[PDB]
């Protein structure tokens, strides 16, 4: 959750809307196990 | 990193690069909420743009820490402070600050 | 490199880009009571990051008419989280404190706020007007929780005594063109190794604008004051039944 | 037997206060060394931050070219001891005979030395203070007559049973300490320890003294410290009859072995009402003299 | 010498002059969860003497025609003391327990309990009476808290399983010509090295007559088994804001 | 760093787990030693106190007068191995034509071994295990007659794609593991490893798998296991038109490299339902044989 | 900006235990994702086609 500590304050000639990117990852103690085929499978028909 | 789309609401064709980026304005000082999201990786919702998230879906389980950064984009003379949050299992979405 | 700051405890952490350095009350770090002041006989419980963490308490408007508002520590705490579920199980508490209020604004805005920590703040009436009258402050003006209390007359700290002097007690200055925020680290403060969390307020946390917050009309006119705080080396001992005051 | 890193590696029970400064030997003010002109880029001593909280470190040597003076004036008359110790008037009973007050040849006096404002000041410029006493105990008749009356006075700790009359049974006092002296005597002094619980007395606490709910009737307790409350001061003219002459007696406190912590703003109201901050909103007077203008003198 | 015990942890001390010795269960002390066996990253909280102490919890008069009860750890304690705070606040919970199952009478009264603990101790219902029904049972009866649950059918322990296998569990018994009181000691069981004090119950403690209660008319007939016990090195981790289930 | 005493003999920490009992090797059973009579006063191995909670040490050699007898009768087959390394049926699979079912010519069966009480009987007579496993799927027509017919077994972890159609994408099997089989073919068999997050399987979890309010609809999930929910094992016939033939295909499942915790007692009541202990209350029927008085055989 | 991942780990976010882990990475190696069999190719041969 993202909460507003204090405010987004800026000066007179200055957008009063701006926005914030993310970025995700992995730290290193991260691991994965048992290789499986993934939910999706992007295809509708046979592909020509 | 890869960009996590925490604004995962629009979704005509022409908007669609908006789920790339949420916003924030000036507000009324009352600790208001701005975004959230489950922290689930490799769950439906914001973490599927992530490639963390897609290589997720190709292995059953998964054990680690992970991190989010986020970047903001206002202009110089903007000013802030914002509390992120982390609420581990069990404690449902905080009903405030 | 000192006007950049992280502050990490318990399972919370904290930053700022334009800090002022921290100021450590009366040159002292927050320690355990030792085997030789202490005087109860139970062995105390330590909770540690349970309790010795960041909890973000109060959020108020800094207006160009403000006066100014205080605290009562530990009474702000004594109702959240679980530190105050052992400050009402326990009889004895003591701990020292890492105080973070936070203030922000534009290169555009100005504006400086005091702020002080004072201990054993007792606050005073004004005896009726004419001073006639032996009045006495409501609990709710004494101990004003977390929502903290107004000050009546700042420049005599609503206890008849010149906030002009109040720079002899730990402060720091949030003066908007320079920080955007104050740090101040207070060691345990009291004439006894332990006391009640619950009847005695160790000291008072001031924040007090001095120079007005003032900008042009188009600026952001909302200038938010948030107070975050973390116990240190927080004790308990003389457990028994929960008890709010 | 511990065995878990984080537990080991803890450092949860540390008692020593590491501490940031240290006392030095400072019997003389400091002296000033010469110095000469300076004319450089990156050293400004001239600028400081006060945001910071600490006071400028720019001495004179930095900012005007200084000559050598050896100072040698002494630092010894403002140690809290040279300060506080010289008595002061901290307590007055009257015991008159045809009287609304005490006509009954008794008085109990609770010790309090916040009655009087000079001594109350200096005390109040320190949050809690440990020391000894001297008490000196002055009577005479209302015209500051010397008539030949012989007084008892008692120390009546809290718990010990308070005179009710001038021929209570207390007045034994097989265990308290009294002391008989005459009018015509000098005044009578004595030497007082160090009493409270505490480690330190306290000129102000900012709780209640018990649990409960703190209701209107119970705000009157708001700032009650125990731990100063040392017990009644009785005195008495000693006989069955009533004493011929009215008389006045003025209790005069010596600290001595002081120890003082967390000095604060010195008061700047009237004080109203003994142990109670109280001031009268009404008439909130600046700390000091004012001007008709910044400009002008 | 075998007879008599004490038993102090924390605040609290327990005697006995008509002991049977004590039980640890699965022969192991409690013990903290190591370096190599945790997983989750965060510094736990051990809150030591103020939950690791006796909670007298309940009392169950015994009957010439009691059927037994059972209660469910850690869910018994979840809502009280300390104990009960730090369950709440947290995600993870691991600790051990020391049970002590307390009945006196008289020389002339006659009767055994038997007293065991029971891992993992899931409930079953009678599908239907015929079987055709998939029913399961309601969430008091499977978490019945401080005041336990009373068998329905004590001969298969409501769960399809021979009461009289139940001694394959740590336990003792309270045989009036012989003893007061069981007490049996368990350290943390489960697969995983932490876990919700809320959704799982580790263990069920069994408390259930084998030989009847019996006396002559004349003898006090109000015989009480009380229920105390005391957490052994508690840890917490996973902070956050209180949550009862 | 530590100061205070309570905390520096602290044993806050110690993650040993003190052990009051320790293996010993046991290939045979033990050998009776001679004894001869015993007429002593304060040695008494025959009394015991079972209140206590332990089982009789009392031996043969102490009750009786025993002769010398070398045991060397082996104690191999009764280790977890040797009891559960035999291969038991733990799932069925229809594929008929005309159908109520699966007339559609695939089938999905969630992993689940509780649906015979041969086997189920067995595990649960522990809480937790942990091993590897040995599969084994028989197929064949109803009538157990061998016919031409390709299959497609393909294991489907939780999360990856259920085919939903003997034509599914989902068969591409592009990352899980699958086996092409026929039924003239002997039966397929394969190894399969412990693949739980947990560090065992456990055959009873007395909670739930969620938190919030356990209200009368979600109390069919009290006592469900994510941690033993494994997966899917999902077969078909191999082609795009229907097969010719109706067939059963029967998994059996040997376990291997096992270990045990906690033993319990054993079922004793028909089992009524797949993980959940239910039970018919109108026929709980005594564990054993009766008969009609304890003076009688 | 600078357009590398944040080098920030938990032991300076939070105050950590220790924790010694034996989590394995093998299953995800090139060999371990890629070296399973799965379909790429189908051929029909039908009579009357
Ligand atoms: C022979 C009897 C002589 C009388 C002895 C008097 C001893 C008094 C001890 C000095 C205590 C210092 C004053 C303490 C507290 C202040 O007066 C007020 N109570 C503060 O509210
Ligand atoms: C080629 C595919 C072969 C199919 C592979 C099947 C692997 C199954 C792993 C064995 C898991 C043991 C059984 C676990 C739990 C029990 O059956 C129940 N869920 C208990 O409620």
């Given at each position: 959750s993202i909460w507003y500590q204090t405010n987004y304050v800026v000066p007179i000639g200055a957008p009063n809307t701006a926005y914030i990117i993310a970025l995700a990852a992995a730290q290193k103690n991260f691991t994965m196990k048992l290789c499986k085929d993934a939910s999706d499978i992007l295809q509708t028909g046979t592909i020509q | 990193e890869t960009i996590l789309e925490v604004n995962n609401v629009p979704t005509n064709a022409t908007s669609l690069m908006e789920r790339l980026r949420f916003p924030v304005s000036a507000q009324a000082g009352k600790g208001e909420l701005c975004a959230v999201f489950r922290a689930?990786?490799?769950?439906?919702?914001?973490?599927?743009?992530t490639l963390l998230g897609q290589l997720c879906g190709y292995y059953t389980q998964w054990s680690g820490s992970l991190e989010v950064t986020f970047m903001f984009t206002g202009s110089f003379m903007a000013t802030g402070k914002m509390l992120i949050a982390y609420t581990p299992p069990g404690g449902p979405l905080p009903k405030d600050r | 490199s000192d006007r950049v700051a992280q502050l990490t405890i318990g399972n919370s952490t904290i930053t700022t880009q334009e800090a002022a350095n921290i100021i450590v009350g009366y040159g002292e770090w927050p320690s355990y009571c030792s085997d030789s002041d202490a005087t109860a006989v139970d062995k105390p419980?330590?909770?540690?990051?349970s309790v010795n963490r960041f909890y973000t308490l109060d959020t108020k408007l800094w207006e160009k008419s403000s006066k100014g508002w205080y605290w009562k520590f530990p009474d702000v705490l004594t109702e959240t989280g679980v530190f105050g579920q052992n400050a009402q199980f326990h009889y004895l508490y003591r701990s020292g404190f890492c105080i973070h209020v936070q203030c922000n604004a534009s290169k555009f805005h100005q504006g400086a706020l005091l702020v002080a920590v004072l201990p054993e703040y007792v606050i005073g009436t004004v005896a009726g007007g004419t001073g006639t009258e032996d009045t006495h402050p409501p609990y709710k003006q004494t101990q004003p929780g977390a929502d903290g209390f107004e000050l009546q007359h700042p420049y005599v700290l609503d206890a008849g005594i010149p906030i002009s002097q109040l720079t002899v007690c730990p402060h720091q200055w949030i003066n908007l063109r320079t920080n955007n925020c104050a740090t101040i680290i207070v060691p345990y403060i009291n004439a006894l190794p332990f006391d009640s969390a619950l009847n005695h307020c160790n000291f008072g946390l001031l924040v007090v604008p001095i120079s007005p917050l003032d900008y042009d009309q188009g600026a952001t006119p909302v200038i938010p004051i948030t107070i975050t705080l973390a116990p240190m080396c927080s004790e308990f001992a003389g457990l028994r039944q929960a008890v709010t005051q | 037997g511990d065995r878990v890193a984080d537990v080991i590696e803890s450092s949860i029970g540390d008692s020593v206060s590491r501490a940031l400064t240290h006392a030095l030997p400072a019997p003389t003010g400091q002296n000033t060394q010469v110095s000469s002109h300076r004319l450089d880029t990156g050293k400004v001593p001239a600028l400081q931050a006060a945001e910071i909280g600490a006071s400028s470190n720019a001495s004179d040597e930095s900012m005007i070219e200084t000559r050598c003076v050896l100072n040698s004036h002494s630092t010894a008359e403002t140690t809290l001891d040279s300060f506080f110790s010289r008595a002061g008037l901290v307590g007055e009973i009257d015991l008159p005979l045809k009287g609304t007050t005490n006509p009954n040849g008794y008085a109990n006096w609770d010790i309090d030395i916040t009655g009087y404002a000079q001594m109350r000041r200096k005390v109040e410029l320190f949050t809690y203070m440990r020391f000894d006493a001297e008490f000196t105990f002055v009577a005479c008749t209302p015209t500051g007559e010397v008539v030949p009356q012989l007084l008892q006075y008692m120390f009546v700790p809290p718990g010990a049973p308070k005179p009710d009359s001038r021929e209570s049974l207390a007045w034994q006092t097989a265990t308290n300490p009294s002391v008989f002296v005459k009018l015509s005597d000098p005044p009578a002094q004595v030497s007082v320890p160090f009493m409270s619980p505490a480690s330190a007395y306290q000129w102000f606490y900012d709780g209640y003294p018990t649990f409960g709910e703190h209701k209107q009737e119970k705000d009157l307790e708001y700032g009650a410290m125990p731990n100063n409350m040392m017990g009644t001061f009785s005195v008495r003219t000693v006989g069955t009859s009533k004493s011929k002459y009215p008389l006045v007696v003025r209790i005069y406190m010596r600290m001595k072995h002081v120890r003082a912590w967390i000095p604060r703003p010195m008061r700047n109201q009237n004080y109203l009402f003994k142990a109670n901050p109280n001031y009268a909103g009404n008439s909130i007077k600046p700390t000091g003299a004012s001007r008709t203008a910044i400009t002008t003198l």
């Open positions: - | 689930d990786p490799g769950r439906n919702g914001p973490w599927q743009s | 419980t330590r909770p540690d990051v | -």
